[PDB]
């Protein structure tokens, strides 16, 4: 169940990528965090990953659609 606290927990993960705090994670933010994760995805890889979550087709992920992806995987306890 999406509790109030969980919404805040998701925010912590969002701000981890959104460095400047614009509210939208671009390929630059993603690439920076990905490198610290021990990986090195190319431009094409980064953009493709964005398109996976972006159901609008704007080339950027915001908090609302970010929640949708998280909830979609959290609603599965199997």
């Amino acid at each position: 169940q999406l509790t109030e606290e969980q919404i805040a927990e998701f925010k912590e993960a969002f701000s981890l990528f959104d460095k400047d705090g614009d509210g939208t994670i671009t390929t630059k933010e993603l690439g920076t965090v990905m490198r610290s994760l021990g990986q090195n995805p190319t431009e094409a890889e980064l953009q493709d990953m964005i398109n996976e979550v972006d159901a609008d087709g704007n080339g950027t992920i915001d908090f609302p659609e970010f929640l949708t992806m998280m909830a979609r995987k959290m609603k599965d306890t199997d």
């Binding site: 927990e9 912590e12 993960a13 981890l16 990528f17 994760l37 998280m70 995987k73 959290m74």
Partner: peptide, 12 residues
């Protein structure tokens, strides 16, 4: 900080 690591995996 563990939770953040888990949430990061869900982002992959």
């Amino acid at each position: 900080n563990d939770r953040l690591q888990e949430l990061v995996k869900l982002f992959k």
